[PDB]
């Protein structure tokens, strides 16, 4: 029914602007009470921070309130500007919808959320390379040094998620991350189906499409 | 400013069995005849899904073995029969003052009988060679519970500080765990060595488990 879609995420600079977008689909933004954006720091917990409501009356967290939020009834779209980006404004930013019985800041609708990182440093796209097989067998990619996160990997073009293992990113010394997914097939058909991880990085508009053939 | 208290930090129950967990407010959350607390649920790397608002309504389309009780300070969160999809963090939030802040969250695991790992070795691609970096990965494959070792040898040296892991949450289908361990050579030293082994040791195991290749081969 109803379905948030964020965009405006991605790399941002220290002390530039951010704004976020979200939206709404298969629902009028001016039949909700109120949008809210709600912000998760990497391993930390939720943080509201700010709402606009039909009305057009605004709140913010006082933790940040060098931000603004806006709504615009005709693009069916709500926005969060923050400017003076830190490091602590480095999270996942979700939008979300207020409610309109039994108060109104309990969320139910959300969106997909979108990873923000603030940093200086400058993009780099990834290397794809293959984790040949040698019952059941396993192969995989190495998605290998890129910046900044997050990295999307499917197998077959979504078609295969049964047994696949895609890993939690490692920071490694150069400054890059790199990460690997698995996938456990049936060893009767390494030689009829054909297996291809689908790599996406899009702060560098990096799309690879890597086949694991048995060596 | 309201502060709120979850409690545990984390838990782990067998499936099936009840998980009982509770949020305590610095202050009363009680207005009107209602109790401004909610719970959500939020699974790995998903956006929270609410469960419980005004302290004990139902979310529609949640499914009834999730309730919320209490009033004031004290709330209480319970699943009546813990399902493997019910893995994820849970958290409490009040819905009467601004900020609006949530609970600090509590990590609900299920705990299943022990499951030795299946280990898996690859060794590099070709085309990795010719950067002149050689990545080794280890595999270690649907185990529980979490903690496993593994240990890395080069023709029988054991290695130290060239490796790095990377552990999965805990799968819903199978309620286990996987690792990720990848050690890094450089292309001379690779093409200078034929055994690369990976020792896994696990508690599901009688004896460490060692997979091979020889390089060449």
């Known amino acids: 029914e109803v379905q948030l879609v964020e965009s405006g995420g991605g790399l941002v600079q220290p002390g530039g602007s951010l704004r976020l977008s979200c939206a709404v689909s298969?629902?009028?933004?001016?039949?909700?009470?109120?949008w809210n954006w709600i912000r998760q720091a990497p391993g930390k917990g939720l943080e509201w921070v700010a709402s606009?409501?039909?009305?057009?009356?605004?709140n913010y967290n006082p933790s940040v309130k060098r931000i603004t939020i806006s709504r615009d009834d005709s693009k069916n779209t709500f926005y969060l500007q923050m400017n003076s980006l830190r490091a602590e404004d480095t999270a996942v930013y979700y939008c979300?919808?207020?409610?309109?019985?039994?108060?109104?800041?309990?969320?139910?609708?959300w969106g997909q959320g979108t990873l923000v990182t603030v940093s200086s440093a400058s993009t780099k796209g990834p290397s794809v390379f293959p984790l040949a097989p040698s019952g059941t067998a396993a192969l995989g990619c190495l998605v290998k040094d890129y910046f900044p996160e997050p990295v999307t990997v499917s197998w077959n073009s979504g078609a295969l998620t049964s047994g696949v293992h895609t890993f939690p990113a490692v920071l490694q010394s150069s400054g890059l991350y790199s990460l690997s997914s698995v996938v456990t097939v049936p060893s009767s058909s390494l030689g009829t189906q054909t297996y291809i991880c689908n790599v996406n990085h899009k702060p560098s508009n990096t799309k690879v499409d890597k086949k694991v053939e048995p060596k | 400013d309201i502060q709120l208290t979850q409690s545990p930090s984390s838990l782990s129950a067998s499936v099936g069995d009840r998980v009982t967990i509770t949020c305590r407010a610095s202050?009363?959350?009680?207005?009107?005849?209602?109790?401004?607390m909610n719970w959500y649920q939020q699974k790995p790397g998903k956006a929270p899904k609410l469960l419980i608002y005004?302290?004990?309504y139902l979310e529609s389309g949640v499914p009834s073995r999730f309730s919320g009780s209490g009033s004031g300070t004290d709330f209480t969160l319970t699943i009546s029969s813990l399902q493997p999809e019910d893995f994820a963090t849970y958290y409490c939030q009040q819905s009467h003052e601004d900020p609006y802040t949530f609970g600090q969250g509590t990590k609900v695991e299920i705990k299943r009988t022990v499951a030795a790992p299946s280990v898996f070795i690859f060794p590099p691609s070709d085309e990795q060679l010719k950067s002149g970096t050689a990545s080794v990965v280890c595999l270690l494959n649907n185990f529980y519970p979490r903690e496993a070792k593994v240990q890395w040898k080069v023709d029988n040296a054991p290695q130290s500080g060239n490796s790095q892991e990377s552990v999965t949450e805990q799968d819903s289908k199978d309620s286990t765990y996987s690792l990720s361990s990848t050690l890094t050579l450089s292309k001379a030293d690779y093409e200078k060595h034929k055994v690369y082994a990976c020792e896994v040791t696990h508690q599901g195991l009688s004896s460490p488990v060692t997979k091979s290749f020889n390089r060449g081969e």
């Open positions: 005004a302290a004990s």
């Open positions: 606009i409501t039909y009305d057009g009356s605004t």
């Open positions: 298969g629902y009028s933004i001016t039949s909700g009470y109120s």
């Open positions: 202050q009363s959350v009680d207005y009107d005849g209602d109790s401004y």
């Open positions: 979300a919808r207020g409610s309109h019985y039994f108060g109104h800041w309990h969320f139910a609708v």
